RNA sequence: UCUCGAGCCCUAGACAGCCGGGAGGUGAGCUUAGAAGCAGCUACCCUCUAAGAAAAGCGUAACAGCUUACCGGCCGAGGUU
């Protein structure tokens, strides 16, 4: 449950709002 | 194209050679204004979008030569 | 080769392999006729960014060139100490 993997997703969900797994992760949100 | 940073500094710095030990031996100084100009001579040689970042790069060789800022 | 134990990593994809990226200021400064990761000395900073050293090992007269770091992909279950 690395913190950076958690921070990444948020950073991504932040751009979508305004690693493939992390993208799918951010998208699923 | 445009000449290298190291040299551009040695011009407005008023000196020629750096110090045997960077930051540990201050050779010259540079007003932020002066640095704003150097960052204008290398607009192409740098990846930075804003002029701010362009300075960070330029202001990356200075302190590592004894080129203090004011 | 068999058996028992401890720590850490892992399907938010581990370990290995293969493919792709390994970038700009800038060939850092100094030394030097020259030295551009890689003779020596000192420093070892910041942009772009998903990464990418002021460079870990060869390589060069010096470049070039070849890989490590680091990131991404394919793969898919244990792996490592």
Swiss-Prot record, chain A:
Forms part of the ribosomal stalk, playing a central role in the interaction of the ribosome with GTP-bound translation factors. This is Large ribosomal subunit protein uL10. It comes from the Archaea. The lineage of its organism: Archaea, Methanobacteriati, Methanobacteriota, Stenosarchaea group, Halobacteria. Belongs to the universal ribosomal protein uL10 family. Part of the 50S ribosomal subunit. Forms part of the ribosomal stalk which helps the ribosome interact with GTP-bound translation factors. Forms a heptameric L10(L12)2(L12)2(L12)2 complex, where L10 forms an elongated spine to which the L12 dimers bind in a sequential fashion. Has been called L10e and L10E in this organism; in this case 'e/E' is for E.coli-like, not eukaryotic-type protein.
């Amino acid at each position: 449950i690395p913190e950076w993997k958690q921070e990444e997703v948020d950073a991504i969900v932040e751009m979508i709002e305004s690693r493939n797994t992390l993208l799918e992760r951010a998208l699923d949100d | 194209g445009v000449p290298p940073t190291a040299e551009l500094i040695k011009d407005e710095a008023g000196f020629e050679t750096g110090s045997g030990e960077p930051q540990e031996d201050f050779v010259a100084d540079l007003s932020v204004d002066q640095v704003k100009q150097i960052a204008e001579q290398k607009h192409p040689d740098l990846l930075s979008y804003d002029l701010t970042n362009a300075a960070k790069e330029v202001v990356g060789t200075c302190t590592s030569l004894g080129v203090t800022i004011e």
